[PDB]
Ligand binder design. Structure first.
Ligand SMILES: Nc1ncnc2c1ncn2[C@@H]1O[C@H](COP(=O)(O)OP(=O)(O)OP(=O)(O)O)[C@@H](O)[C@H]1O
Ligand SMILES: Nc1ncnc2c1ncn2[C@@H]1O[C@H](COP(=O)(O)OP(=O)(O)OP(=O)(O)O)[C@@H](O)[C@H]1O
Ligand SMILES: Nc1ncnc2c1ncn2[C@@H]1O[C@H](COP(=O)(O)OP(=O)(O)OP(=O)(O)O)[C@@H](O)[C@H]1O
Ligand SMILES: Nc1cc(C(F)(F)F)cc(C(F)(F)F)c1
Ligand SMILES: *[C@@H]1O[C@H](CO)[C@@H](O)[C@H](O)[C@H]1NC(C)=O
Ligand SMILES: *[C@@H]1O[C@H](CO)[C@@H](O)[C@H](O)[C@H]1NC(C)=O
Ligand SMILES: *[C@@H]1O[C@H](CO)[C@@H](O)[C@H](O)[C@H]1NC(C)=O
Ligand SMILES: *[C@@H]1O[C@H](CO)[C@@H](O)[C@H](O)[C@H]1NC(C)=O
Ligand SMILES: *[C@@H]1O[C@H](CO)[C@@H](O)[C@H](O)[C@H]1NC(C)=O
Ligand SMILES: *[C@@H]1O[C@H](CO)[C@@H](O)[C@H](O)[C@H]1NC(C)=O
Ligand SMILES: *[C@@H]1O[C@H](CO)[C@@H](O)[C@H](O)[C@H]1NC(C)=O
Ligand SMILES: [Ca+2]
Ligand SMILES: [Ca+2]
Ligand SMILES: [Mg+2]
Ligand SMILES: [Mg+2]
Ligand SMILES: [Mg+2]
Lengths: 329, 326, 330
C-alpha cells in the first residue's frame, strides 16, 4: 500500500526535522558548557543623619551603615537602630521582660536557662518605680526593645546607591568578564540609576528601587528589617562575540509571617576606653539584608559533543526505520 | 503459541509497570523541579562570666562571642580565649618560639622570613632570667600561646541558644517559605529546644546538642576549637498543600587528626586610645565554627514533563514491542 | 553470505567492548557518587611596617590586615591604605570633587542626590587656597583620596604566608577528610612553601606566589587592588585507601579593565573616644580579595549502579541486534 508507505516516510521526515531542530538549534548539543567562578564586591554611597532626643546629630556613612565593610556579597544596610551608650560592667536591674520579682526572697542566685542577662545577685533592686527586677552582673544599662520607632531613623536608605562589581571567569575557556562589560563608560557610570528597561547594564542600583522590585514596601521593611536577594545570571555564548555576554539582575524578597519573628535584626557592640574605664555602645540594628548570588554557564563549540549528538541522531533514526518491519505486510 | 506467549505478555506488563511506576510514580516525571534561593540569619542568646587573673570578671554577650555580629551562614562562637592587654608599639623582646640568641651579635637586623613577629633591631633583650630573645619593633606585650586553659573559659557555651531564621524562595513557582512553619507559634518559641524526634520543627538549637549530634565532644572541642556544619534541606512537593513543606536539619562534624593542627583558632584585635596613646587588646580565640548550608528542590505539576515522560515510556515499550517474525 | 555475518559479529563485539570500556571504566558507572560539605579556615602570618611622613611607624599584623578576621573563606588582605585620622563630626568644606561653589548663594541647603558627603549649610567655605566648596556637616577632615601611593605601603605582602585548612565530609559515605594529609607533618609544616610542581600538597601558600600563579602582577594589584580566587577540588575514588585522596589547588585571577574602576577598594572606620569626644580613623584600603570555593565528589562501589549500567548494556546490545539489520536493506 502506497498510503501507509508515504505516511511512514512523513513520520521519518518529521522525526528528522525534530531531531535536527532540537539537538542543535534548541538545546545547542554541539556546544560544551562550563561554569564560572565569580567574586562580588559591594560599594554603598550615601549619608544618613539621625537626631535622637537628648543626643546631638549623628552621621552614618559607608563605614557605619554597611556591616561587613569589606565588600562581602552578603551584607546588611542599617535602616533603624536602638542605641544604649556607656555600658559598664556592674550590678543593675534586669530587663523586666526577662524576669520580675515581687520580693527579694523569690529570686535565686544563678543564671537564667534560656535568656540570660547576667548573674542574679538575688537582692532584687528596683527597675521600674512600681515593680522590681532581678539584679544581674552584666553590661548596664540593659537594652530596651519594647519601643520601636515607627519612622525609620535611616529612612533615606531608599536613595543610597549600591555599586556591584561582579568579576566572573570561565577556566575551561579561560574567559574573564565583568558586569561593566564594554558599554558602561566613565560618563555613563555617573548618571545611571538602574531601571528594569531603561538602564539594565548599569551597576549602580537604588536600594529603594531594588526593594520595590523585590515586592516589598521600603518603609515596613526598613522599620523592622527584611531580606532582599540579588541574583546575577550570566548567559555567555563563546561562538558569538564577547560583547554579547551581558549579565541579568533579578531581585527577590524573602519574607515570612509578620506575626512571628518579623524582619531581620542583630545586636552589635562598639568597645572603647573612657576615663580609664572600659565601656561599650550597644546597637540593635534592624536592616535590610542583601544576599548576592551569581550563577552562570558558558557554551563553546566542540566536536566531541557534536559527534555524540549526531550518533544519538543516527540512533533515533534507527528507531523510526526499524518500525516498517517489511511494511508490516 | 502460548508457552512463551504468556511470557511475552508478562515481559510487556513488566515494561509497562516500569514505565508507569519507577519512571512515573517514583522519580517524579509529572512535575517540573526548581531550586531555591535562601538566606539564613543566626542569633545567639547567651552570657558567659569569665574570671581572669589581672583582668577581673569579664562578661561575654551576643555581641561579644559572635565575631561576625551581623549574621551569616559561617559564624564562630567564642569558647576559649587568650588575652594580651595594653599592646603598644615599642621595641620589645620577641617570643622565645621565634628565635633564641645568647648574644646580641647573633641576631641580624631585618624581618624574619617565616612567622615574622617584627623588625629585628639587631640587638638581643632578655625575655626573662632564663632565655634571651632578639629585640623587635612591634606590640610590646608579646602574646604567649604556650599555655591553654584546660577548663574552657566560656564553658557555658553548650547552653547558649541559636535561632536560625531561614527564608527560601522558589522563583519559577513563586513560593516563599520560612523555617518557622505554621505549626510553630510564639508560645512554642518561648520554651523550645530542638530535638531530632521530640521537636523536629523547632528553630531554636542548643550548641551542646548540635555538637553532640555532629559526633564530637563539646569539652574537647571548646578546648581547642571545632567545626560543625548545619545543613537545612527543603524537600517540598507543591502538588500538596503548602503547609506540608518542612525543613530537615542535619548536623555534621568536620574534624581532623588532632596531632597536626587541632581545632580552629584565630587572632583578632580591639584598638582603642588610652591616655592619648593608641593601644589594643589582642585575643587569640578558639571557637566552634558553624556553617549553614541550605539546598532544596520544589516540584510542581506541568504538562510538558508529563508528555515527555509518556513519550519516553512509549519507546521504553518500543524495545519490547518487537516481534518474533522474519 | 558469510561476510555480512562476520561484519555483524564484529560490530556486536565492538559495541560490547565500547559498553565495557566507556560506561563502566571511563565514567565509573559502577560507582555511586556523593557530594561533600566543606569548611575553610584561613590564617595569615606576616608583618608589615609602614612609615608615614609626620606620623609614627605603623605595624600591621594578622589582626590588622585580615579584615573578616574570623578565618572566613572570603577575605581581603590589606595591600595599600589611605588614612584620615581624628575625624570628628563637625562642619567642614566638602570634598572638591563633590562640588565647587564660586559664592555662598550658589550653595543650596540640603543633601546631594548622588554621593552625598554631608548636609549642606548653604555656605561656601574655602576647602583650600585656590578653590572653595560648600560647607557640610560630617566628619571634620574629608578624605582627599586622590593620591594613591605608587609604592605599595604594605609591599612586604610580597612575602607573606597563608595557611588554608579545608575540612570536607561526605555524609552518604560518612567519610571525613582534611587538607592536611599523611604526607604533611609538623616538621614539613614548619618550612613548607607551596609550589605547584614541587609541593602540591603543601598547605602554606605565599600570597605573591598565589597572585603570580593566578596570572596577575603582584605590584600592580597591591597598588590599586585585585581579585584572586583559590579553588580546592577533591576528586578521589574511595575504592582505594583514603590515603590516595589528594586535594588540588587552582588559582585564578579575576580582573577587569584598568580604565573603568581598577582593582578592589573599601572604606572602613575605627571609632574611639578621646578627651571625652567621639572620633574615628577612616581607612580606604586597596587589597587583594581571596575567595575560597570547594567542589568535590566521591565515588563508592555499589550494586545498584552496577545493575543499572548492565541493564543499559543489553539496551545497547539490542540496539545492535537490529542496528545493522536496518542497515541491511539495499
Ligand atoms: N555606590 C556607588 N554609587 C555611585 N557611584 C559609585 C559607587 N561606587 C563607585 N562609584 C563610582 O564609580 C567610579 C569607580 O568606582 P571605584 O570602585 O573606583 O570607587 P572609588 O573611585 O575608589 O571611590 P571614590 O570615587 O570615592 O574615590 C568612581 O568614580 C565612583 O564615583
Ligand atoms: N536564640 C534564641 N533563643 C531563644 N529565643 C529566641 C532566640 N532568638 C529569638 N528568640 C525569640 O523569638 C522571638 C522573635 O525573634 P526576634 O529575632 O524577632 O527577636 P526580637 O523580637 O528581636 O527580641 P530580642 O531582642 O529578645 O531578640 C523573640 O521574642 C525571642 O524571644
Ligand atoms: N599562615 C601560616 N603560615 C605558616 N605556618 C602557619 C600559618 N598558620 C599556621 N601555621 C603553622 O601551622 C600549624 C597550624 O596549627 P595552629 O594554627 O592550630 O597552631 P597554633 O596553636 O594556632 O599556633 P600559632 O598561633 O603559632 O599558629 C602551627 O604549628 C603553625 O606554626
Ligand atoms: N566564609 C563565607 C564568607 C562569606 C562572606 F564573608 F562573604 F560573608 C559568605 C559565605 C557564604 F557562605 F554565605 F557564601 C561564606
Ligand atoms: C514599667 O516597665 C515597663 C516595661 O515592662 C515600661 O514599659 C513602663 O514604662 C514602666 N513604667 C514606668 C517606667 O513607670
Ligand atoms: C529620594 O528621592 C529624591 C532624591 O533623589 C528625594 O526628593 C526624596 O525625598 C528621597 N526620598 C527619601 C525617603 O529620602
Ligand atoms: C556610555 O555608554 C552609553 C551606552 O552604554 C552611551 O549612550 C554613552 O554615549 C557613552 N558615553 C560616552 C561615549 O561618552
Ligand atoms: C504552639 O505550637 C505547638 C506545636 O505543635 C502546638 O502544639 C501548640 O498548640 C501551639 N500553641 C498555641 C497556643 O498555638
Ligand atoms: C586645591 O584644591 C583643588 C581641588 O579642586 C586642587 O585642584 C588644587 O590643586 C588644590 N591646591 C592646593 C595648593 O592644594
Ligand atoms: C621578599 O624576599 C626577597 C628575598 O629576600 C626580597 O628580594 C624581596 O624584596 C622581598 N619582598 C618584599 C620584602 O616585599
Ligand atoms: C615530613 O613530611 C615530608 C613530606 O611528606 C616527608 O618527606 C618527611 O619524611 C616528613 N618527616 C617526618 C619526620 O614525618
Ligand atoms: Ca577609646
Ligand atoms: Ca563576615
Ligand atoms: Mg527582647
Ligand atoms: Mg604558637
Ligand atoms: Mg575619590
Amino acid at each position: 500500500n502506497k498510503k501507509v508507505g508515504v505516511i511512514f516516510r512523513l513520520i521519518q521526515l518529521v522525526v528528522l526535522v525534530y531531531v535536527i531542530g532540537w539537538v542543535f538549534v534548541y538545546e545547542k548539543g554541539y556546544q560544551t558548557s562550563s561554569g564560572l567562578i565569580s567574586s562580588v564586591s559591594v560599594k554603598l554611597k550615601g549619608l544618613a543623619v539621625t537626631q535622637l532626643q537628648g543626643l546631638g546629630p549623628q552621621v552614618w556613612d559607608v563605614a557605619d551603615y554597611v556591616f561587613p565593610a569589606h565588600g562581602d556579597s552578603s551584607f546588611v544596610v542599617m535602616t533603624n537602630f536602638i542605641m544604649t551608650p556607656q555600658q559598664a560592667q556592674g550590678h543593675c536591674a534586669e530587663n523586666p521582660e526577662g524576669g520580675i520579682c515581687q520580693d527579694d526572697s523569690g529570686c535565686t542566685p544563678g543564671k537564667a536557662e534560656r535568656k540570660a542577662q547576667g548573674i542574679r545577685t538575688g537582692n532584687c533592686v528596683p527597675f521600674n518605680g512600681t515593680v522590681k527586677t532581678c539584679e544581674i552582673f552584666g553590661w548596664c544599662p540593659v537594652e530596651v526593645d519594647d519601643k520601636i520607632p515607627s519612622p525609620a531613623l535611616l529612612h533615606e536608605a531608599e536613595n543610597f546607591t549600591l555599586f556591584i562589581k561582579n568579576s566572573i571567569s570561565f577556566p575551561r575557556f579561560k574567559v574573564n568578564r565583568r558586569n561593566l562589560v564594554e558599554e558602561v563608560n566613565g560618563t555613563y557610570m555617573k548618571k545611571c540609576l538602574y531601571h528594569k528597561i531603561l538602564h539594565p547594564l548599569c551597576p549602580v542600583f537604588s536600594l529603594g528601587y531594588v526593594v520595590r522590585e523585590s515586592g516589598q514596601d521600603f518603609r515596613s521593611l526598613a522599620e523592622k528589617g527584611g531580606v532582599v536577594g540579588i541574583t546575577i545570571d550570566w548567559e555567555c555564548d563563546l561562538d558569538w562575540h564577547v560583547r554579547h555576554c551581558k549579565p541579568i539582575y533579578q531581585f527577590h524578597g524573602l519574607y515570612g509571617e509578620k506575626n512571628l519573628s518579623p524582619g531581620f535584626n542583630f545586636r552589635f557592640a562598639r568597645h572603647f576606653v573612657q576615663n580609664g574605664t572600659n565601656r561599650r555602645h550597644l546597637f540593635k540594628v534592624f536592616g535590610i539584608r542583601f544576599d548576592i548570588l551569581v550563577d552562570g554557564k558558558a557554551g563553546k563549540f566542540d566536536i566531541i559533543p557534536t559527534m555524540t549528538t549526531i550518533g544519538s541522531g543516527i540512533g533515533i533514526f534507527g528507531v523510526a526505520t526499524v518500525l516498517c518491519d517489511l511494511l508490516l505486510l
